[PDB]
Amino acid sequence: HYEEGPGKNIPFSVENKWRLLAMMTLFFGSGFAAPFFIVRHQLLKK
Amino acid sequence: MAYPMQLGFQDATSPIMEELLHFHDHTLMIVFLISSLVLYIISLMLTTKLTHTSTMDAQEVETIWTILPAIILILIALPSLRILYMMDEINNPSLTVKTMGHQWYWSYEYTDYEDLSFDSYMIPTSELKPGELRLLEVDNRVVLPMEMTIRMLVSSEDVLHSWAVPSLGLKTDAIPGRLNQTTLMSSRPGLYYGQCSEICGSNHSFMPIVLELVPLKYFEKWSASML
Amino acid sequence: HETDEEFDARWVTYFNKPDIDAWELRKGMNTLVGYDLVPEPKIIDAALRACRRLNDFASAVRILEVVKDKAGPHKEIYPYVIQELRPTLNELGISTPEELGLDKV
Amino acid sequence: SVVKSEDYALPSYVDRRDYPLPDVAHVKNLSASQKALKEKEKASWSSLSIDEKVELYRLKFKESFAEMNRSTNEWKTVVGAAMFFIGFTALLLIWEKHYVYGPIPHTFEEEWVAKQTKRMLDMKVAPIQGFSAKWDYDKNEWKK
Amino acid sequence: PSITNKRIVGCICEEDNSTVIWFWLHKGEAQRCPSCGTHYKLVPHQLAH
Amino acid sequence: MFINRWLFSTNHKDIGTLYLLFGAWAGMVGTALSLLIRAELGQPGTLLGDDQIYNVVVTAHAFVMIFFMVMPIMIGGFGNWLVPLMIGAPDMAFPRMNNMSFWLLPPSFLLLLASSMVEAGAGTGWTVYPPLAGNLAHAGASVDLTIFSLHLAGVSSILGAINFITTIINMKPPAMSQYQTPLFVWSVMITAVLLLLSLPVLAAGITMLLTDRNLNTTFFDPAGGGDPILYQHLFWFFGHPEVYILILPGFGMISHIVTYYSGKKEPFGYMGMVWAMMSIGFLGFIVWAHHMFTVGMDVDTRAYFTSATMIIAIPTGVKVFSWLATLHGGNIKWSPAMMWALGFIFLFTVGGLTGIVLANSSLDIVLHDTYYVVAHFHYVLSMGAVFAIMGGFVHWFPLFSGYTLNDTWAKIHFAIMFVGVNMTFFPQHFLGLSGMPRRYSDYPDAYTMWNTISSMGSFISLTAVMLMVFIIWEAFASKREVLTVDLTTTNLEWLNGCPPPYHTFEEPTYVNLK
Amino acid sequence: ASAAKGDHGGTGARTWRFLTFGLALPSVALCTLNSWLHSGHRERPAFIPYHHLRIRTKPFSWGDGNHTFFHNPRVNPLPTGYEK
Amino acid sequence: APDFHDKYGNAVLASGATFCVAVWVYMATQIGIEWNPSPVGRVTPKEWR
Amino acid sequence: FENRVAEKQKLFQEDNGLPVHLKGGATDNILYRVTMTLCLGGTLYSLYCLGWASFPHK
Amino acid sequence: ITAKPAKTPTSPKEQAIGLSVTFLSFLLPAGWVLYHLDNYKKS
Amino acid sequence: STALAKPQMRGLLARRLRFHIVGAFMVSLGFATFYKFAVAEKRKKAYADFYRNYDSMKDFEEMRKAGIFQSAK
């Protein structure tokens, strides 16, 4: 069986709030950054 | 054309656009009344310490808020449909002009008597003469006779485009393989602008429409000389 | 529905039941405050007495607090009800929220 | 007094204006003195002292109506912080105008605008209400 | 009936009410619906012999 | 154990969590795209390039916000999490198929990203109209990758619809009739019915565009006797129901939030609310041509579509007044969720009203393909749908996670967002009335002021989005565990604690038939 | 099709009454609105004595044998034209 | 006992409002942003032909 | 043919803690590993193809 | 809703850190691309 | 040492609603009257005034002399 309770019903860990901040930063940051880099990609092709 | 900081519609140039302005004033008043009434009621519900949390009966007040909106919708639909049918009235034009949309410019054809036709491209910003409007001027304008009922036929030779002139209340899609009709009638002489209104690719933002309304006499001379 | 007197009577009767228990006391007050009204002094009277029979002083004071709350902005209703309930408050030894300093934040 | 996580299935205490009499008492476990007070409570309430009465009240309820209904200064923090962040946004806009945006088209130059304006007046742009209607063609100036 | 100590009860106080009143019914003395007061009593376990 | 739980899930809660995570990520992508749009329009001139790269951005912004952010969050996230709990069900009818509806989304999103990576992207508008979207004006794989993205998202939603309808009809307690289920459950079922009926038509239409582009068919090519307008009918037949699919679950959550924070045990006029959602769902299938008022249709067809479209204001009006009637007499709790709901009621009404302005084919001649339309839909989507999502998120976050958010920070988040979206979209009404066309990378000089103000408002919204990420972090960082929640007697989803155990309702609820 | 609403958990009297007052009667009210709007007597067409119309192979068994059963003077001409 | 708002409320409100107004006014007038206001009442029409 | 459902019922109800997709025996394991390998390998390959198509080959 | 005191309280200093890191994760990459926009446009 | 008179104790919420709903209606009427004067009528009069003695040829002559036309110099 699986772990249950606050902080245990999720695919990411919230054991360390700083490691968590790193996770969330990469997660949400990669999403927000993607369009900018795709725009850069399109501009650097021609 | 639109001027800096404009809030509403461009001034009406045709009797039909005038008709739309009054219909919009009518509709907008209802929009303001209903939206402010809702905002008011929200504030009214939220500003009292008095309570009533038990079951409230609804089959009584729902008659009110079903019949009222129904009446209001009819009060909007009546003039809306009167105008709609008015735009469809048989009018019998004195001239027929065709316009074909292209990527990315418009071509015009006046083929009632002579076989006159030309392309109409946007004047590049680098090329504007002093006092000319950026993105709106074209090399060849659509010379037309003022105070006359004209039939405009719109189509396209490639992708979809849409021929629009806001001041005249016009917007007719340019569809390849189809000939759409609309009628034009300017109450005044002058220059009237519009822009392509259907996404057509790379230069969708840069293929304007410019109508030049002049008296019949000048229209004729122009006709001849444009052979 | 029913007349004002019939509603009042129905609630006076409810709280006047000799063997009314704690659950029924709470159910009655919690239900009563859901209506668009400040209960009549006669209903409050009956409820305060039920508190006495249940040896519940704290609830008697809470009931007076809810009556003031139900009046909202109408500051003249509580003083009047407390006026009308003075005999009973005296008799049962019920101190008002004010007298207990329960009205200060 | 002290609530636990796994007690979600049990009746709980709540301080609410519209639910004046909660399902449970604020304090369920009583000291020697407190149980003595609940016994005294079975006798006439007139024999109860003010401090005994308030102790009875606080055993039953957490907060009084006045305490539960108090207003706060939270709005100052909310409105002030909102303004700080909206202010911070202006910093982003300053950064953008400085490092991202290049110069705007030459059609915005003062001279061009002056000419363009005359031309718009010459073609009588919006003569009924919008623009040219605001120019006095007789006195040759903007209508006062 | 319940195979444990408590079970959630949903009470439709009056026929055709759209609102259902929900609460945990615990082993022990009968409890009452917080809305209509009707009584419920838990009668624990078994099912599987 | 990690893989079995998160990749092989057959649990409605975990699957709902995956959807919420996916939708949150998609929201960041969609926000970035909206920033690029407003950066390009922030001052006169060209910033990025011509209309192609600009419209590839506009097109992706729409697809991401609609298909990857709103639908996954509302239906897949809140739907999966709450529906089973609200009817006391042990899980969804098809728990395994439910997992596939989720897993089809990342591939669908990858195809969308691929389409913008290859060639010059698909700068067609989210409506993907041919011939611009055809193999001559948009040669290459871009448009084909876009069509495939829609196919996968389509299959995901259709299977999700089948699962929700079956669960809602078949898995309620024996004594519970359909008229005893919460309004959110009603909103999800109706939404599922609209998805089931509309998506297959879209699928037919985009498959025909695919064959026109790759198998030499000519459904939309006049040279072969085809018609570009046929595509528009097929698209919009799905397109209008789609906008109601985007707002219905929102209406459902608003009913719950307004009832809850008004301290009420029930929403005002329950049966009227059910009637209203059903009517809206029905009417939403017979009004599609209002997206085609300038294509050249007969006047009688246009008079019919104008009339049919306005009727929806009646049932929608019943819902608005019922929400106000639910607030009436309430012991109002000014929580952050309530704020989002109140903003929704007002802002959605404004957006709906401008929709009624657009319903008039006469006026629409002048408003069509202008920013007046963009203003209308962003009030109902960026304020309506989004506020419902934010309200539901702050209201149920404690339930899903077991932790509480900081209310003050949440109220600050609401204030910033409220200013941002209004500053962004209100000025767009002026731009529309005055004639600024949609899908333009640059505009005539006269439109400069309103475009400048609109772009500044978009930056304020960005600040709100960044703050929200921080707020969620702070909640998980501080770990304030939930103890008690009020009103559980009329909010069954909270009755199993926060968060509820992996398996809930192993022993079903007891409900007398009397 | 599947319509656009939902129920189906059990179609009973309450559901059919819901459909009667929430869908059926409102539809009749709308069509009644539309009809008692598009009405108005449209101008009767010029009379042309077409040989395939106003047939008379035997007189009718009522009146003067030349008027149809629900003859409307305003819109139904006789074989010789409209009436006075 | 005084909370965050009682202790810092007035300061947060005062300096938040001050900062906001200051930076927005700066951005609106000191960085070269073209607002393109109406010529009505401000521009003296100049010969173009 | 003869009815062997009872044999299959015994096999699939055997309390060995195996998930239904692997409860048939060693073959289930193989087929699963083949399926998953083709899926993940094929996905990596599609990513590679995307990377290739993302750039012009003039 | 009632809740227990934070199990791992996040002080004002900690929040400033989380806020700043959060804002930077959004602003830096986009800012970088936007800054080098001209370098991209023609190269 | 005076008594207090029995204040109204029932339907205070409903009474408040009725009073304010009626006031909202009055304000709507006042707004309608204002709008149908500061916007509607103003617009009709502006166009009616402009076209009453409008001379299209004179207007065209002015534009031609200013040189805005391509077909009429």
Ligand SMILES: CCCCCCCCCCCCCCCCCC(=O)OCC(COC(=O)CCCCCCCCCCCCCCCCC)OC(=O)CCCCCCCCCCCCCCCCC
């Ligand atoms: C794309 C993802 C990048 C991830 C980067 C970091 C990875 C570190 C690994 C590892 C370092 C070791 C750490 C072990 C524990 C934590 C990490 C982990 O492995 O966890 C993995 C988890 C979780 O992810 C994390 O690890 C970061 C989590 C941040 C959580 C924020 C919570 C936000 C608030 C509310 C959420 C809802 C619920 C709320 C209420 C409470 C719950 C109900 O994911 C899943 O198993 C599936 C998630 C699916 C939905 C996400 C997006 C799919 C996106 C794009 C399709 C793209 C197309 C191509 C696009 C290609 C690019 C252009």
Ligand SMILES: CCCCCCCCCCCCCCCCCC(=O)OCC(COC(=O)CCCCCCCCCCCCCCCCC)OC(=O)CCCCCCCCCCCCCCCCC
């Ligand atoms: C941000 C830029 C603002 C620019 C303002 C105008 C400058 C005028 C100069 C100088 C003014 C005088 C000279 C020019 C007169 C032109 C008349 C014209 O041609 O007339 C037509 C024009 C102009 O219309 C007007 O006559 C302007 C009306 C403005 C209404 C504003 C409500 C604003 C609320 C809060 C501020 C905005 C943001 C939040 C908006 C939130 C949603 C409303 O075009 C419109 O129709 C635009 C609006 C489209 C429809 C929106 C409908 C629902 C809106 C609000 C309901 C609020 C209810 C509660 C009451 C309001 C509660 C908040």
Ligand SMILES: CCCCCCCCCCCCCCCCCC(=O)OCC(COC(=O)CCCCCCCCCCCCCCCCC)OC(=O)CCCCCCCCCCCCCCCCC
């Ligand atoms: C009898 C008739 C006359 C009555 C006169 C009043 C009598 C009152 C008696 C009795 C009235 C009820 C009194 C008790 C309420 C509880 C008081 C308390 O113990 O609790 C403390 C509570 C109190 O809450 C309040 O109490 C004030 C609430 C204001 C909420 C606004 C919500 C808006 C939602 C939707 C908006 C559209 C619809 C708006 C509808 C609005 C309705 C009020 O919480 C706050 O203090 C925190 C939140 C403040 C900021 C709110 C959001 C601003 C959003 C957009 C603009 C940003 C501007 C800044 C940034 C600017 C940047 C430029």
Ligand code: HEA
């Ligand atoms: C749901 C749909 C949605 C949403 C929310 C938005 C939001 C925004 N949109 Fe819009 N937009 C569309 C759908 C949407 N849009 C569509 C359909 C089109 C037409 C495309 C076409 O023409 O083909 C369009 C077009 C469009 C244009 C017109 C382009 C043109 O014609 O040239 C512009 C211009 O300003 C614009 C701007 C914005 C901005 C600034 C926002 C901002 O308000 C965004 C602010 C950020 C958010 C509101 C996201 C927050 C949500 C989350 C991050 C989830 C959080 C996670 C949890 C709570 C779990 N959009």
Ligand code: HEA
């Ligand atoms: C959440 C999404 C959503 C919702 C719910 C709606 C709801 C409505 N929409 Fe909107 N609409 C869109 C999303 C949405 N729309 C999108 C995305 C587009 C553009 C697509 C594209 O081209 O890319 C669009 C386009 C669009 C057009 C096409 C315009 C054009 O392209 O030229 C029209 C035409 O009629 C329209 C009408 C309506 C109407 C009448 C409603 C009605 O449902 C609103 C009803 C609500 C109210 C009226 C308010 C509440 C009512 C009351 C308070 C009662 C009293 C009211 C009266 C008496 C009037 N919409």
Ligand SMILES: CCCCC/C=C\C/C=C\C/C=C\C/C=C\CCCC(=O)O[C@H](COC(=O)CCCCCCCCCCCCCCCCC)COP(=O)(O)OCCN
């Ligand atoms: C109000 C709607 C309901 C319709 C019926 C109500 C009243 C009419 C009386 C009986 C009708 C019963 C069946 C139909 C038989 C013939 C068609 C009648 C339909 C009808 O009523 O048609 C009318 C003709 O009336 C005519 O001749 C009708 C002349 C009446 C004589 C009836 C002739 C009887 C012949 C019956 C044959 C019976 C065989 C049936 C066998 C069944 C199986 C064995 C139309 O009027 P009109 O002026 O021409 O046009 C209108 C112009 N303003």
Ligand SMILES: CCCCC/C=C/C/C=C\CCCCCCCC(=O)O[C@H](COC(=O)CCCCCCCCCCCCCCC)COP(=O)(O)OCC[N+](C)(C)C
């Ligand atoms: C285009 C826009 C349209 C504009 C909208 C117009 C809004 C309608 C305006 C007014 C509605 C008037 C309804 C009158 C109901 C009387 C209210 C009342 O007082 O509420 C109850 C009635 O129950 C009941 O109807 C149940 C309680 C009240 C039921 C109705 C309340 C809801 C009213 C709406 C709330 C505001 C939202 C308005 C929406 C715009 C009280 O019960 P009783 O007195 O029997 O018991 C109390 C015991 N006694 C006997 C001792 C006093």
Ligand SMILES: CCCCCC/C=C\CCCCCCCCCC(=O)O[C@H](COC(=O)CCCCCCCCCCCCCCC)COP(=O)(O)OC[C@@H](O)CO
């Ligand atoms: C360009 C090309 C695009 C290609 C897209 C392809 C998308 C996916 C391809 C791979 C999917 C196939 C894998 C098999 C899916 C079977 C689902 C199924 O059979 O699901 C069943 C439920 O749906 C039921 O019954 C009834 C429903 C049966 C649905 C069958 C699934 C077919 C998927 C395609 C759907 C297309 C949509 C059609 C309209 C255009 C079983 O439910 P489970 O939750 O499993 O179990 C519940 C347990 O109690 C069973 O004991």
Ligand SMILES: CCCCCCCCCCO[C@@H]1OC(CO)[C@@H](O[C@H]2O[C@@H](CO)[C@@H](O)[C@H](O)[C@@H]2O)[C@H](O)[C@H]1O
């Ligand atoms: C719409 C979303 C975007 C909102 C706007 C973003 C807000 C500002 C973010 C700051 O980001 C940056 O700022 C820089 C300048 O301040 C860069 O430095 C750069 O510029 C320099 C200094 O001029 C150099 O030191 C380095 O070489 C350098 O690349 C830089 O790379 C980038 O990270």
Ligand SMILES: CCCCCCCCCCO[C@H]1O[C@H](CO)[C@@H](O[C@H]2O[C@@H](CO)[C@@H](O)[C@H](O)[C@@H]2O)[C@@H](O)[C@H]1O
């Ligand atoms: C299978 C089922 C069908 C069974 C057969 C249907 C029977 C139909 C009966 C019709 O009978 C009628 O006959 C008449 C003709 O005599 C009418 O009177 C009339 O006819 C006249 C007699 O000349 C006039 O005097 C009057 O104006 C008047 O209209 C008349 O109203 C009507 O009742």
Ligand SMILES: C[C@H](CCC(=O)O)[C@H]1CC[C@@H]2[C@H]3[C@H](O)C[C@@H]4C[C@@H](O)CC[C@]4(C)[C@@H]3C[C@@H](O)[C@@]21C
């Ligand atoms: C073997 C089985 C009898 C029942 C049993 O298995 O015990 C028989 C009965 C009926 C079946 C047969 C049916 O009569 C239908 C088919 C007819 C033949 O032409 C070919 C094989 C055919 C496809 C079937 C094969 C046969 O082996 C079956 C399967």
Ligand SMILES: C[C@H](CCC(=O)O)[C@H]1CC[C@H]2[C@@H]3[C@H](O)C[C@@H]4C[C@H](O)CC[C@]4(C)[C@H]3C[C@H](O)[C@]12C
């Ligand atoms: C009959 C049905 C359900 C009643 C029930 O069983 O509880 C109710 C629910 C909603 C009602 C409808 C809505 O209240 C909206 C309309 C309100 C008008 O007062 C009458 C018609 C009207 C169209 C209503 C007819 C009917 O009374 C409906 C359809």
Ligand SMILES: C[C@H](CCC(=O)O)[C@H]1CC[C@H]2[C@@H]3[C@H](O)C[C@@H]4C[C@H](O)CC[C@]4(C)[C@H]3C[C@H](O)[C@]12C
């Ligand atoms: C738009 C669609 C045609 C799509 C297509 O060309 O493929 C057509 C098919 C049938 C049409 C409908 C039917 O002809 C019946 C109605 C006829 C009226 O004159 C207008 C509305 C009316 C309800 C029509 C509206 C619209 O023109 C419909 C719905």
Ligand code: CUA
């Ligand atoms: Cu041509 Cu857009």
Ligand SMILES: [Cu+2]
């Ligand atoms: Cu639509």
Ligand SMILES: [Mg+2]
């Ligand atoms: Mg269009």
